[PDB]
């Protein structure tokens, strides 16, 4: 089955006898759930974090049913704003990126050369991102301030509209946010333009 990206790719998961809503997130190495009680040994871990590291609890070898597939893998629990199914569990259900609208497996970060300023960069393909967020660069044209959120809090960015970006040979044009990001992120706004789907 093919899952398009005009809307957030939310799915119902079953974990510890509980249903929850989670986002299928190719931009995440791991799976990060909002505060809940899970049965298991768990070890303190520190991840990611806009502004620094956030503390999470790391539960290993947990059953998680997703779209009717049973993964058994690592779940991190902590102060994420949304439940996040990362690649560690997307691989287990056999999810890939595709131009359903070349296949990009999810064993590694779906990194892809983009060309945007008439300039060329490496950028993550991120289904868990609404918008495209690019590392600090000069871009021509008018731009307005925006605050966007992720794990750890918010960062301030500049919002440029109607910006052309080439991605794996495809031409996309729309909104690009520019701000202090370790990694360029191609979000759904653009992913949809170029015809990308989550398939498993």
């Amino acid at each position: 089955p093919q899952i398009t990206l005009w809307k957030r790719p939310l799915v119902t998961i079953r974990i510890g006898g509980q249903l929850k809503e989670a986002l299928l997130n190719t931009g995440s190495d791991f799976t990060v759930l909002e505060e809940m009680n899970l049965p298991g040994k768990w070890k303190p871990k520190m991840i990611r974090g806009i502004g620094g590291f956030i503390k999470v609890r790391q539960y290993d070898q947990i059953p998680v049913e997703i779209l009717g597939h049973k993964a058994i893998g690592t779940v991190l629990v902590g102060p994420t704003p949304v439940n996040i199914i990362g690649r560690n569990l997307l691989t287990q259900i056999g999810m890939t990126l595709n131009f359903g609208g070349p296949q990009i497996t999810l064993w590694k970060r779906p990194l892809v050369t983009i060309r945007i300023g008439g300039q060329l960069k490496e950028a993550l393909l991120n289904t868990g991102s609404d918008d495209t967020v690019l590392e600090e660069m000069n871009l021509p044209g008018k731009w307005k301030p925006k605050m966007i959120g992720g794990i750890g809090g918010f960062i301030k960015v500049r919002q440029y509209d109607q910006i052309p970006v080439e991605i794996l040979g495809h031409k996309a044009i729309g909104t690009v946010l520019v701000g202090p990001t370790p990694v360029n992120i191609i979000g759904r706004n653009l992913l949809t333009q170029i015809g990308m789907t989550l398939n498993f």
Binding site: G27, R48, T80, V82, G86, N126, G149
Partner: peptide
């Protein structure tokens, strides 16, 4: 690395 931008 958990990237995600709402």
């Amino acid at each position: 690395e958990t990237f995600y931008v709402d």
